[PDB]
Amino acid sequence: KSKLPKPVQDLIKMIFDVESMKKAMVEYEIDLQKMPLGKLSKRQIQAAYSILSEVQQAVSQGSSDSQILDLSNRFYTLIPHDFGMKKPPLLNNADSVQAKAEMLDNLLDIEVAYSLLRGGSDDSSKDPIDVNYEKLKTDIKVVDRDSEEAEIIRKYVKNTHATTHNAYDLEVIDIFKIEREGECQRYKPFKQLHNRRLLWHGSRTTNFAGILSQGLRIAPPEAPVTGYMFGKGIYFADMVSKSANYCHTSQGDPIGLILLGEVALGNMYELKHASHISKLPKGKHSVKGLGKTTPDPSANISLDGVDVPLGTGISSGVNDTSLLYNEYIVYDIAQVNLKYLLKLKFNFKT
Ligand SMILES: C[C@]1(c2nc3cccc(C(N)=O)c3[nH]2)CCCN1
């Protein structure tokens, strides 16, 4: 039997749950009879991204519905969808491309989780929780609820829940301090960079085995750059609720996971509207999508020499922006050092 703390054991059980992976796939309209969890491969997902890029080229070139039909059909051939003997809906716009790009990002992490579960050794004398913990190559510790780091984290959660995201409230269940093997070494060129911030990253529970084993990643070269507001980078928020929305929790699944990462932002390229970029302008280290609301800058605190924007939301003074809240994007995976993982209970008021 495992000697790991019970919250860590529960975390391991949640992220390696095969039934949750199947549920995420069903939620995406994937046909599990034609494409089961065991049949998903990087190769297949990459080919589907490539086809999605062919679809975005046709939609931006102003091709007709009759013209896009074969391209749309091609995507469904690669990623079978649950439509029986009926015709699938046509993928003929930016919204459908974005929705499918997001789905493939999820399938990529699910494939990683399933590969870990299948690519190791079998020893019934060992607790499978300990076995699965070892596959993450991540030191996971429970943060003491009475510690200063827990107090700062709780304040960050308490103060940055947006009024527009009030259909639920958040209860912090557990706070974990995480250390991905080799990440400290990888982050070394950015460890003293100016404008290092502690930011939120929300994701579906089914993506966490991938995130902990591989770190936060950028969509592959095959992925459509127009499938993401600021292109192919790693996205963070300074508002807990903005990132919590990306956990995709519900009344039937109200427990989610959120990350706190130290992000080396450096010289920020400030944008108010979509810019589908792959690379940054010279001398820029990140993109800051300017929100109408920002955490109060006077309330900014330092945790282990990193800025924590835990102030309550105030007007940024930014006019005519597509964003209600800030978002930060890095285009080099080495600019992220994951620090904490929170298990949240979503209390839906609706
Ligand atoms: C829509 C998209 C995304 N935009 C975000 C902005 C702020 C935070 C997050 C997050 N996950 O915490 C975001 N995720 C684009 C790339 C992945 N999904």
Residue numbers in the entry: 662 to 1011
What does the paper say about this structure?
Poly(ADP-ribose) polymerase 1 (PARP-1) is a highly abundant, chromatin-associated protein that is a key early responder to genomic stress in eukaryotes. Upon sensing DNA damage, particularly single-strand breaks (SSBs) that are the commonest form of lesion, it becomes strongly activated, catalysing addition of poly(ADP-ribose) (PAR) to nearby proteins, including itself, and thereby signalling for assembly of downstream DNA repair factors. A key component in transmission of the allosteric signal is the HD subdomain of CAT, which alone bridges between the assembled DNA-binding domains and the active site in the ART subdomain of CAT. Here we present a study of isolated CAT domain from human PARP-1, using NMR-based dynamics experiments to analyse WT apo-protein as well as a set of inhibitor complexes (with veliparib, olaparib, talazoparib and EB-47) and point mutants (L713F, L765A and L765F), together with new crystal structures of the free CAT domain and inhibitor complexes.
The most noticeable characteristic of veliparib relative to the other inhibitors studied here is its small size; when bound, no part of the veliparib molecule comes close to any part of the HD. Despite this, veliparib has a high affinity, not much below those of talazoparib and olaparib, implying that the more limited number of interactions it makes with protein are individually strong. This in turn suggests it is likely to cause stabilisation of nearby protein structure by quenching local flexibility, and this effect may transmit through intervening parts of the protein structure to reach helix B in the HD, thereby slowing its NH exchange rates as was seen in HXMS experiments with the veliparib complex. In contrast, for veliparib there is a small difference in the opposite direction, consistent with the possibility that destabilisation of the HD subdomain in the veliparib complex by DNA binding has a slightly higher energetic cost than it does in the free protein. The SPR data is also relevant to another outstanding question, namely how it is that binding of veliparib causes mild stabilization of the HD subdomain, and thus leads to allosteric effects in the opposite sense to those caused by EB-47 (60); as confirmed by our SPR results, prior inhibitor binding causes slightly weaker binding of PARP-1 to DNA damage sites in the case of veliparib, but substantially stronger binding in the case of EB-47. The sizes of such effects range from those in the veliparib complex, which shows only negligible CSPs in parts of the HD distant from the inhibitor, through those for the olaparib complex, which shows appreciable effects only in helix F (that may in part be due to ring current effects), to those for the talazoparib and EB-47 complexes that show more widely distributed CSPs in the HD subdomain, particularly in helices C, D and F.
